[PDB]
Amino acid sequence: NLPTAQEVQGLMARYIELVDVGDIEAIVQMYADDATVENPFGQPPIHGREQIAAFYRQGLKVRACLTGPVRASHNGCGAMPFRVEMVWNGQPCALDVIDVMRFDEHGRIQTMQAYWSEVNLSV
Amino acid sequence: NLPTAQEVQGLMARYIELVDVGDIEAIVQMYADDATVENPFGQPPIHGREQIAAFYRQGLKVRACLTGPVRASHNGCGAMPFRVEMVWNGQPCALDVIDVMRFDEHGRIQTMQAYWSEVNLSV
């Protein structure tokens, strides 16, 4: 059901583990079927698992690690800071991001907002 | 005006500096006159500078430190992770928090959501 705060901490940590290994189908399964993603926040959202899978397939050697604890609420939401390390035109880079997620009553991500901009990239 | 991503980084960093010294009047001035604060996110919002002042006066020796970079967007919003250290019944404790802010056209905080729960407290 709709995650408690402990359950949100666990779900968001699992998300980062899935991004880190790059398991696109497992990441997509964490989302509700009609979830929305705004990544970076400020951009038009993407809707549904097909579009979300496309987004992660395009983005995802990548590593992702939490860079602080998950902050969870008592209403099925949480926020976390992390860093993604990737290769862009042969150049290692890193991006610092904070995601905010809202989970539904089945423990699936209903909405995701990713906060970052070019200021958060390190080449 | 409405802050660029660089300006959001600067404003949110300034907010932490003001919380760290405990300058309640300077903090309240960062908010729009009719701003809303949800802290912790999940609790009913408070509205307006008078209630926001009361909130900070009650919450605020306290220290506050960013524990990673500000993540700013291009639509006048940002998110940041930080830690607040305080004394509760003579016991030092720390709270890990992520705040999301939305700034208005004058560079004032229109809405603040603070993410954390008891899971983020260390006594």
Residue numbers in the entry:
A (entry chain B), B (entry chain A): 2 to 61, 65 to 127
Quote the paper.
We have systematically dissected the potential contribution to catalysis from electrostatic complementarity in ketosteroid isomerase. We first describe KSI, an enzyme suggested to provide electrostatic complementarity to the transition state via oxyanion hole hydrogen bonds. Phenolates, analogs of the transition state and reaction intermediate, bind and accept two hydrogen bonds in an active site oxyanion hole.
Further characterization of KSI via X-ray crystallography, NMR, and isothermal titration calorimetry (ITC) was more readily carried out with one or the other enzyme: pKSI for obtaining a high-resolution crystal structure and for calorimetry and tKSI for NMR spectroscopy. (A) Electron density map (1.5 σ) shows that phenolate is bound at the oxyanion hole, receiving short hydrogen bonds from Tyr16 and Asp103. Results with several spectroscopic techniques confirmed that the anionic phenolate form of the ligand, with a negatively charged oxygen, was bound rather than the unionized phenol form. (B) For phenolate, the average angles are 15° and 47°. The ability of KSI to bind phenolate ions in a mode analogous to its reaction intermediate and transition states provided an exceptional opportunity to isolate the electrostatic behavior of the KSI oxyanion hole and thereby evaluate the energetic contribution from electrostatic transition state complementarity. a, observed with enzymes from two different sources and by two independent binding assays, suggests that electrostatic complementarity in the oxyanion hole provides at most a modest catalytic contribution of ˜300-fold. The results herein indicate that hydrogen bonding in the active site of KSI provides little electrostatic advantage compared with water. In summary, electrostatic and geometrical complementarity may each play modest roles in catalysis by KSI, and there may be additional contributions from better accommodation of the steroid ring geometry in the transition state than in the ground state.
